[PDB]
Amino acid sequence: ILTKEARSYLVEKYKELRKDDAQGFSRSSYRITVRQLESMIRLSEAIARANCVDEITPSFIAEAYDLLRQSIIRVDVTYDKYVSMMNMIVRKIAEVDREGAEELTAVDIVDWYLLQKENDLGSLAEYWEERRLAFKVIKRLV
């Protein structure tokens, strides 16, 4: 039984797990479902059973944690605007690194990006903003 308040840590661990796995959705998700938070518990207690230790450790929690992590990775294979562009950067690279080196003409990234976001463009201001933002990020990046 873990009364221990190091359980607080577990929360951020749960919390550390979903954030990086939020974007992209094209990752292994899942969600990551709360049922996985609920899962980390039974996993923890399992490792407690293993090591005879009672109230466990935050360390064993980290072990169950990494375990779930590889189990996830094996499945992998106002700045919201900047976020959408940074999402484009991470998305393009993450795909191209797995199915290619990634490199090539930086202009192309803007090219196909506009081709994708053109569907979400409600008004010309959205296009112009997306264009100037992606341009701003590349200019900053360089």
């Binding site: 959705f25 094209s26 994708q116 569907n119």
Partner: protein
């Protein structure tokens, strides 16, 4: 003479969608039908308050029902009379159009054909049949039969053209291109198509986080039309 009220799908986006393409897979229905009026009940601020206020009360003292009844007395033709009138006009007289009205309507329809062709040079997705013209005609004779006159007049039609024009205005109103592929499947996936079928695109677009029923059909109908 059929009077039909269809129910459109998915709401306002179907207006964002091509105006036709609504009924089953086929617009032909809408082609047969003369006057198509997709509508709005924009309450002139006095409407929504009308219905609301009506709900609030709806009890005593039958004042509102009364008000309806004097609306019935004054409400133009008693409507018990309107019926007898309609029977009357319907059996008595059969109207006929005037020549200048005719040539007028020729100009009407050729401007329609030409202009809207020019509109469809861009392959703007929507229509024009001579059946529609014939409709316009039948409206003119109908209204001529209102005035009960054995003969049509020009102004008389001048109303009709614009009314039907409102009808034309009614005719006018996972990204698609991405799902519109299916192309990658049709090619280097299946030259036959078989063992592919909607079921395949289902297994292909089932665990890809991706395809809606209308989405799947739309992209399909799209590519079907597109000629891909």
């Amino acid at each position: 003479s059929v009077l039909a009220a269809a129910n459109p799908i998915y709401g306002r986006y179907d207006d964002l969608k091509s105006p036709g393409d609504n009924i089953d897979f086929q617009t032909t229905i809408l082609s047969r039908f003369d006057m198509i009026f997709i509508v709005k009940d924009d309450h002139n601020e006095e409407r929504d308050i009308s219905i609301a206020n009506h709900v609030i009360n709806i009890h005593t003292g039958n004042a509102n029902a009364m008000q309806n009844q004097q609306e019935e007395n004054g409400s133009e033709i008693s409507i018990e009379k309107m019926k007898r009138y309609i029977t009357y006009c319907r059996l008595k007289c059969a109207p006929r159009l005037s020549p200048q009205a005719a040539e007028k309507l020729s100009s009407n329809f050729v401007t329609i054909r030409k202009q809207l062709l020019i509109n469809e040079l861009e392959s703007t997705e929507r229509p024009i049949t001579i059946r529609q013209l014939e409709a316009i005609i039948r409206i003119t004779e109908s209204l001529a039969k209102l005035e009960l006159s054995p003969i049509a007049q020009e102004r008389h039609v001048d109303e009709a053209i614009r009314l039907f024009q409102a009808s034309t205005m009614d005719a006018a109103s996972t990204s698609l291109s991405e799902i519109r592929r299916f192309e990658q499947e049709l090619k280097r996936r299946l030259p036959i198509g078989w063992s592919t079928s909607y079921q395949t695109l289902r297994r292909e677009f089932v665990d890809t986080h991706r395809f809606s029923q209308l989405a799947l059909d739309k992209a399909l109908y799209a590519l079907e039309k597109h000629e891909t």
